[PDB]
RNA sequence: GGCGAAGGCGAAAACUUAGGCCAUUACUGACGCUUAGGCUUGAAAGUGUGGGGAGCAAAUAGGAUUAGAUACCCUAGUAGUCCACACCGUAAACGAUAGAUACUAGCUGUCGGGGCGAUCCCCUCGGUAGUGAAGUUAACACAUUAAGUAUCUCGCCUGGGUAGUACAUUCGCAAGAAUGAAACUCAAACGGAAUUGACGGGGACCCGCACAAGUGGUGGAGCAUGUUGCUUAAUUCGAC
């Protein structure tokens, strides 16, 4: 019902998630690689996050969607299958932007796996 | 970091935005000690001292 | 480590003409005794049309046609219990795999002489039946659903 | 890259404050180097009192792998990491190179002061690096910022295991710090450098029925034959 708006995909190093959301900021839809067949480990593949931003391009179709911008998260190697998928789908991409949660050196992360 | 202004040209672009900002934050998800932080600082300026001249 | 090796050419058969006749009579070979499986196999056509009545090219082309598999899955193992990768098949590997799909499965059945076992397999790959088209589809059906693996391997 | 004597110092401002470099037609006129004892500073961990606690995380609990796992992995998780006043005075506190001074090829950068002056580049005096001969070194290597040629002073070493342990002493509430042996034992040592092999669940490249692609085989039954074990008078001896 709403022409514009913004949807965003956050690319975590284990899972994606894709979400949907009105230009006032609050969301409409959204999928996940969880919320599909597979699960476990072989959730964090290019593939899963590429069908993820599929079903989510698809479901938006009819939920008449037009230019919608596009804030890609996280770190991970999933976030560009997604984008070719959402341009792939037929979508009227417009803008493209980053919003990681880039930190000052501030609060301590964790300890070294070793 | 917005660019884009048809279809391609600044997604082209992006992946240059991308690879910079995941080589900053990967580490800043692992702690190791200030004198490791410098050490593997000057690390990396060798590095571009080798190639980019 | 080697390199790649030559392969040699295959004569049409001289009364049905058809390379891919040659390849049946060569893959349900066993003792190497041509004059028992030409016999075998031309009595498995001439059943083909007694019953059923068509042309035996046609059922065989169909058959073959239907058995040769879209994909193809190749082990290749990182760590315990290893995951497997689809990979794709060439078009002579696919004619390859089908028709030793058949004979294999012509050669386990029920109506105990050859002929008649032989005869029902082909006539049943044709007709898309659990014989071979089933192991065809589960191989299949295995592939492209690890289809993750297969987008990024080597 | 800059500064500090070392530890260390990186968001912005204010106050206080330390030391350093260049030029000096100025001044005192040997007032200089080193330093036993002493004094001051001295990473992090730790301790006493009062606050603070977002994130992280010894100890601890649980879930995984393993034969075991009190470890590596994962989820929680206190002391602590933070601040105010003291105490502790140890580190690979490393340039593994004490301080002060005179002299000893050169080349390539970079930083500051000065003159010249659009930067760039000219050069002078300094600080910080690389390459490099005579010279030194057992070799690696150092080589004008010396491990070179020499002097002055201080500290320290005299085989290894015993052992930085024991006693005594001083300091500290504290864990400990400083100083610090001997009895016994070995002919060598968790000695140094370098050389050739061998090895790496270290890299790079290259072959083979090695893997991969198939065919047909053994381990399932009977039989032949050989071997091990047992047995008897020997079950002749060898091959493993």
Partial sequence: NVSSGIIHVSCSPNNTIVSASDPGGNVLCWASSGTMGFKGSRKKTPYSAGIAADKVAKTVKEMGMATVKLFVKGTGRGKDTAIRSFANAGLSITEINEKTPIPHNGCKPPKRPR | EVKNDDLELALKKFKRVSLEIRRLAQRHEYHLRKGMRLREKRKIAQKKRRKFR | ?154
């Fill in chain 3, 1 to 154: 480590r080697k390199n790649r090796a030559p392969k040699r050419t295959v004569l049409p058969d001289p009364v049905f003409n058809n390379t891919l006749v040659t390849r049946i009579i060569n893959v349900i070979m066993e003792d190497g005794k041509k004059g028992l499986a030409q016999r075998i196999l031309y009595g498995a056509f001439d059943l083909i049309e007694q019953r059923t009545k068509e042309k035996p090219l046609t059922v065989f082309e169909r058959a073959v046609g239907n058995v040769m598999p879209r994909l193809e899955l190749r082990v290749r193992r990182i760590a315990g219990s290893n995951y497997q990768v689809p990979t794709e098949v060439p078009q002579d590997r696919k004619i390859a795999l089908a028709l030793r799909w058949i004979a294999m499965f012509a050669r386990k059945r029920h109506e105990k002489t050859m002929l008649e076992k032989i005869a029902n397999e082909i006539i049943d790959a044709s007709n898309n039946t659990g014989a071979a088209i089933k192991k065809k589809d589960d191989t299949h059906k295995m592939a492209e659903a690890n289809k993750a693996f297969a987008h990024m391997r080597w």
